[PDB]
Amino acid sequence: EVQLVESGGGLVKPGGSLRLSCAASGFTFRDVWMSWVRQAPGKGLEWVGRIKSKIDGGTTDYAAPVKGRFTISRDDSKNTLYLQMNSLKTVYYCTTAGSYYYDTVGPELPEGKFDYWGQGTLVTVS
């Protein structure tokens, strides 16, 4: 069974630096182009960026509004998606959305859902 959750949010004074993480299991993490999206309280999801698969170069993309301050990385031992934050400015959702169309994965699926969506962690800024 697949599950996607995140943890580590909290209140922080602007100007600091920290990192955020997500938890994944039950699926082939390496092949998929997992990415991270954020949803401001009362707003919509804004594409923070995509971290591509290592076979496809591992290229990292970011959106212009958050360009130059954020960084999305990957690890295999923990099956964990990361979103470090630098120069904080006044809910985050790890995902595998938008990946099935580029990654190389067969038709076999853990249940039949090729999407994977995080629990959602709220991060508040002072």
Added chain:
Amino acid sequence: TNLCPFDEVFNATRFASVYAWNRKRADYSVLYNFAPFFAFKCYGVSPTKLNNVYADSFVIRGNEVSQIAPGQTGNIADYNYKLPDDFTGCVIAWNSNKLDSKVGGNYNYLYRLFRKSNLKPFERDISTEIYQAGNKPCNGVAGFNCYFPLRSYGFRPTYGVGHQPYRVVVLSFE
């Protein structure tokens, strides 16, 4: 102990399309042993005798595996991949629906339908030219005879073995 990109070519994480067939330059038993096949016997050569080399990797449809043969005439043969009648090479295909097919189909895979010059053998035309020349080129798709050279086959598990996907590596030993 000898290493070749043949394992990389065959077990490629992503294969190339037919219109742009990925081209790379001993022991070849691993090629025929690793997967059961629908068609692997060499057309123009002997299966046992194979063991300059051009490994032309792409995916082709099951009914079109026979189309990749010396002197054969058809859609894949005329335009996508034309082979010289006096060529010594083997076509090797295995049903890889588990690997390269996708829920909803894998549409990254393409082939070249028609090039007006009947394609010379071992010649690749990558250009996205809209169908060539004619009485009125018009440079744009607003009528007949001006088609984009590319079309894609979906690759689904429910597809029949004839329409199921085969990773053919048309290796032409020279």
Added chain:
Amino acid sequence: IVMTQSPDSLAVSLGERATINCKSSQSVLYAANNKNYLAWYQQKPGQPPKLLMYWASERESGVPDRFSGSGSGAEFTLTISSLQAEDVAIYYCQQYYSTLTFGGGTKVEIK
């Protein structure tokens, strides 16, 4: 590539047709593949979102036929045949041709 949903907030009653139009700045349809690069996600309040359709036409497995989509060029649409109690969620049309751009987001609710 700027992505815009129609509208920012949609209201649909139980079981009625729920059409959500999408419009993009550039052209998403790939000339070679002859199909678009689009997706559709629904987000229930408080827990993970989910994927309705992919390739702007193909259907997620495990969810019946009421989900329906059809897109071409830079204009896309996802239409829902019937809205159920669990179907109530907030939606995000997505493109993946170059980068990925979730739009402003369309939230649907029972009338």
